[PDB]
Amino acid sequence: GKITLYEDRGFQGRHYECSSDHPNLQPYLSRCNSASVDSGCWMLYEQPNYSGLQYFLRRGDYADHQQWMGLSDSVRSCRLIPHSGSHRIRLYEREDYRGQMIEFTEDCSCLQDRFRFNEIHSLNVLEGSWVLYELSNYRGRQYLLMPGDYRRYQDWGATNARVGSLRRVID
């Protein structure tokens, strides 16, 4: 994978090139207002060491931070998400994998149209990486999910159990 981050809009300003995870961009970029993804699925993080607001980027060109749904021009770490050959996620009504349960292998622009709950209280990522979104149509806060058990919403770094849409990390 390969991404180029720019301090300014329209691929202008001081830039830096990443080919792997960087936990600390601070010495290199003071801000980030545009990015070009040559290859790979990337998660950008507001704070260093893969914390704070998260943003999913794919192959493509982002001329301003609003095109990756960025609330600000703050990018201080970035993650190259591993390839997954396949994708499967179970979502549960209640914590500790209890209550109603639905299993997705494909993207969902509106969870409430298939699973009539505004909140997901646990989920099991059986295959591949996913991005959860707070709102429908891939909007609101983003949360990267690696294969794993997630017994409560805190386990995927959210401050609430609200979930409106989710998408496979695929290029």
Residue numbers in the entry: 1 to 171
Reproduce, without paraphrasing, sentences from the article in which this PDB structure was first reported.
Human gamma-D crystallin (HGD) is a soluble, monomeric protein expressed in the eye lens during fetal development. The high expression levels contribute to the refractive index within the lens which focuses visible light upon the retina. However, this halts further expression of HGD. This means HGD must remain correctly folded and soluble for the entire human lifespan in order to maintain visual acuity. In order to observe structural changes in HGD, we take advantage of an arginine-to-serine point mutation, R36S, first identified in congenital cataracts (HGDm).
The effect of oxidation of HGDm was investigated by incubating a slurry of microcrystals at room temperature in the absence of light for nine months. After aging, DTT adduct formation is observed at 100% occupancy at C41 and C108 and oxidation at C110 to sulfenic acid. Although the fresh structure shows no significant binding of DTT, after aging of the crystals, DTT is seen to form disulfide bonds to two of the surface cysteine residues, C41 and C108 with strongly ordered density. In addition to these covalent modifications, the protein conformation is subtly different, with an overall r.m.s.d. of 0.23 Å for chain A and 0.21 Å for chain X. However, this is dwarfed by the 0.67 Å r.m.s.d. between chains A and X in the aged structure and 0.62 Å in the fresh structure. Aging of chain A leads to an expansion of the NTD and a contraction in the CTD. Aging of chain X leads to a contraction in both domains, and a notable reduction in the distance between the two. In contrast, the aged structure incurred a radiation dose of just 0.02 MGy. To control for the possibility of radiation damage-induced loss of DTT in the fresh structure, a series of 20 consecutive 5 ms exposures of each aged crystal was carried out (burst series) to accumulate a DWD of 0.31 MGy. The structure from the final timepoint showed no loss of DTT. The presence of DTT-cysteine adducts at C41 and C108 are perhaps counter-intuitive, as C110 is implicated as the major site of protein cross-linking.
